[PDB]
Amino acid sequence: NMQEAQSIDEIYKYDKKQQQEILAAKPWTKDHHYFKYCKISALALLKMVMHARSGGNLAVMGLMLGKVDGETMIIMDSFALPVEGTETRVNAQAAAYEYMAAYIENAKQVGRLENAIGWYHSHPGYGCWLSGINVSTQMLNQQFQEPFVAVVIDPTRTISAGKVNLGAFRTYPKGYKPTIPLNKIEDFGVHCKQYYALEVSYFKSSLDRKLLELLWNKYWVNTLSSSSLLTNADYTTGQVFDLSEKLEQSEAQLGDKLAKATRDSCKTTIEAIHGLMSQVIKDKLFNQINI
């Protein structure tokens, strides 16, 4: 069951005509919040993470390759740049651009049919947000290269907490505003009203899943007995709290959001039913032997 292109690998197709039609029509010119979804390949995340950690506490960055399907940015590769940078400020003077177009020209022959879809930057341990000059960077990147998104990575937070600190951001055009609050400015920038985040999800290939499932498990009291359904109790409480506001906004709209709210609630209920199933299978495995 590998020769056929399943629903998992169907995203690995680069249709030149469809992308050309999308880039010619330009539906994003009218709707400012046109893009919402950001799908990212696994290996891009891997290369990004290893490049961020290889530089240590020095900021590193690169250009990513991908396409756009409707309102979803599908990124299929990451790439490193030969730049010199400090903890907070970088230049990318000439070496990056001497290894940017040359890399594209080289990749045109190996089989890489993708083009520039955005850039990722590593912020070492000071949040996932668009800086005061990075917002202008995405300003002039989007003003002429409309299919585009800025990716921000925190290496220190990911390496310490254990969760991927990834953020996909796009900015509003100058003039589109819709005194600063004290809760949306610490997790964002001082120009938080000038940019918004996009939902981020990842995809992989069928052979990737097959290799992962046979790589190494052990994980008997590491996964099969790990206080499941309980470790993310704070996550579930936060989710069940914000579904209240989601449903109340949906009801106000009724007096569409409701499908999104139902999907959001279904995700949590399915996750915790999976936790219950794991607990039940553990009970049937260990407790009920040798009565």
Binding site: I281, K284, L285, Q288, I289, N290
Partner: protein, 213 residues
């Protein structure tokens, strides 16, 4: 490896020297399993003669417990205090092997102790030698053990362990079969729902095509 050293020194010893070595072994701290010493040929050969009481003592300390000794005090020779201590520790191990929550009354009756303080001191002394990892409870009078070292095994309980392992394997197989059946049912249900959706979509597209006449 105190037991290995003792059995090495006991290779050629026989007679009263053998009994003296046995008495030394039975009082040495840190030795709590008398496995390899008993299987030695000379120890079994001491069955004949007037020294069989020592062999019975070794058999009692290998598989038996304190009540067996106190019930057969008349024939077995007297022993030093450390040897009573080792027997009491082994009895605690045997009691914890069966049930993992030892009531205080059962332990007190079996070990023939007077007050709670002496029993608690004895049990903490047993714990201090890393034999078992347990918690003492005073409110409910229930010792809670977690890990206990296995004692000697005769050539009769192998059937029991084989039976238990076979039962565990059968349980694992049944669980795997149930998992397979459940995942198959889920897959077929999803497929059936998808086919139903496809059929209704085909019908609506057909009627839409027909309407434009």
């Amino acid at each position: 490896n105190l037991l290995e050293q003792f059995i090495l020194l006991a290779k050629g010893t026989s007679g009263s020297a053998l009994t003296a070595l046995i008495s030394q072994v039975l009082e040495a701290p840190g030795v709590y399993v008398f496995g390899e010493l008993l299987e030695l040929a000379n120890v079994q050969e001491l069955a004949e003669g007037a020294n069989a009481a020592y062999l019975q003592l070794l058999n009692l300390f290998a598989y038996g417990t304190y009540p067996d000794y106190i019930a057969n005090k008349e024939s077995l020779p007297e022993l030093s205090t450390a040897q009573q201590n080792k027997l009491k520790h082994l009895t605690i191990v045997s009691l914890a092997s069966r049930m993992k929550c030892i009531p205080y009354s059962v332990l007190l009756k079996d070990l023939e102790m007077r007050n709670l303080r002496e029993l608690e001191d004895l049990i903490i002394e047993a714990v201090y030698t890393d034999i078992i990892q347990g918690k003492l409870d005073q409110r409910n009078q229930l010792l809670e053990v977690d890990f206990c070292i296995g004692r000697d095994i005769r050539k009769k309980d192998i059937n029991n362990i084989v039976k238990t392992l076979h039962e565990w394997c059968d349980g694992c197989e049944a669980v795997l079969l149930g998992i397979e059946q459940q995942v198959l049912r889920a897959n077929q249900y999803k497929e059936n729902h998808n086919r139903t959706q496809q059929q209704v979509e085909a019908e609506v597209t057909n009627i839409k095509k027909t309407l434009k006449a």
